[PDB]
Design a protein around this ligand. Structure first.
Ligand SMILES: N[C@@H](CCCC[N+](=O)[O-])C(=O)O
Ligand SMILES: N[C@@H](CCCC[N+](=O)[O-])C(=O)O
Ligand SMILES: [Br-]
Ligand SMILES: [Br-]
Ligand SMILES: [Br-]
Ligand SMILES: [Br-]
Lengths: 226, 226
């Protein structure tokens, strides 16, 4: 499973030819990033399959809801996103293999397909939450494309620490897997590499056991404090 | 001067008839509030005048810059805003009288004319910074108009405290004056009162001594970490 410090960085396999172009068709995120972020969102059930594989089932499309206690800037509201068009589940299966997810019960994943844009004088913020936990058990963050950007350095923190214990800029074709309970994280802003427009295209996958799923009326009521 | 707990709430005089309509002509804030906020911005030199009054001089229009250490979601960047069209200096004089601003040196003020909109299912965030200091010596927040909104409760905090020591919902025609060093503040989100659109129209005035002004090349370089 994960490295002893609670994270692993991996190389990603080649992706299908529809993945990178699909980022050009992500609409603006009306809730986060103040116009610098573009997003699609889908959720899946993840079940252990015989032959020691995993089965993915796309769930009916629902608004994204998270808790203010994890995300103070985007929590506590219904966030209406459009579904992801392409199939990230081959990519996600690489992360699962490295996580060694507990096969004794089913899992539920949130999948966020994000583009953040940077331009001269306007960095693209990646973690306006600051140093945070996502609220899930594991998180996978995969970088699919970077064009004309600098910055975007991932920092991993022990809870309460004054400084991160690991920093690294993930490049296209890399992913980090995180123990999202034991570690906190942030990412420095995306910067324009030369003064002109640039962008950073990623997918974030948040893993929870189905028994603790971030999906459905009970989760929504809890996250919205209803 | 201010109350012994570092703040005072005051009633405001009647304002000129052009002030309330001017909020309809404030452009969207491209940098904060994710489309829920509209803003104009101007800066003034503030000097003591004989017969125990104060004189205001509007300074050449410059981008707003603040520090990430005070504002993690809107700091560290050049924020290009349009100037304020109306004259808030009569209202600001009411706050100055209550502050008892030291007349032994000149001052510099930042003036933010803000509208935050709320709608059903979409609150209007007021302090995405969370509990914060603005970074100035004194702050005045004046409420000019509230239409069909709830929430928007000001909370004042001792430094490092885990709960506020005072809470109150400022109404149209009220202002709070704050010791921005000795106390921190936040405000709960603006909510739609009935499920439909509503808005809250305010002006924020941040006071610094001219010797510590938030204006000009040196300030900008420090706030941008250049
Ligand atoms: N904090 C990110 C989402 C990261 C994934 C967490 N999850 O699915 O709850 C956002 O609010 O857009
Ligand atoms: N934190 C508010 C500004 C409040 C006044 C503070 N000032 O002038 O620096 C914003 O970023 O829009
Ligand atoms: Br944001
Ligand atoms: Br914001
Ligand atoms: Br002068
Ligand atoms: Br009240």
């Amino acid at each position: 499973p994960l490295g002893t410090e609670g994270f692993t960085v991996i190389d990603l396999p080649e992706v299908a030819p529809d993945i990178l172009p699909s980022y050009d068709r992500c609409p603006v995120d009306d809730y986060m990033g103040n116009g610098t972020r573009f997003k699609r969102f889908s959720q899946y059930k993840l079940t252990p399959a015989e032959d020691d594989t995993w089965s993915f089932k796309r769930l009916p499309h629902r608004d994204y809801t998270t808790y203010k206690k994890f995300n103070p800037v985007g929590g506590g509201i219904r966030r209406v996103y459009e579904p992801i068009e392409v199939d990230f589940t081959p990519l996600i299966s690489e992360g699962i293999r490295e996580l060694g997810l507990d096969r004794s019960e089913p899992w539920q994943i949130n999948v966020h397909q994000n583009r953040t844009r940077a331009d001269g004088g306007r960095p693209g913020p990646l973690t306006p939450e600051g140093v945070h936990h996502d609220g899930h058990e594991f998180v996978m963050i995969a970088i699919l494309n970077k064009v004309n950007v600098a910055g975007g350095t991932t920092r991993l923190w022990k809870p309460g620490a004054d400084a991160p214990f690991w920093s690294g800029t993930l490049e296209a074709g890399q992913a980090v897997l995180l123990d999202d309970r034991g570690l906190a994280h942030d990412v420095t802003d995306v910067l324009s590499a030369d003064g002109g427009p640039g962008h950073r295209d990623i997918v974030i996958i948040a893993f929870s056991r189905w028994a603790e799923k971030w999906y459905g009326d009970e989760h929504d009521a809890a996250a919205l404090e209803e």
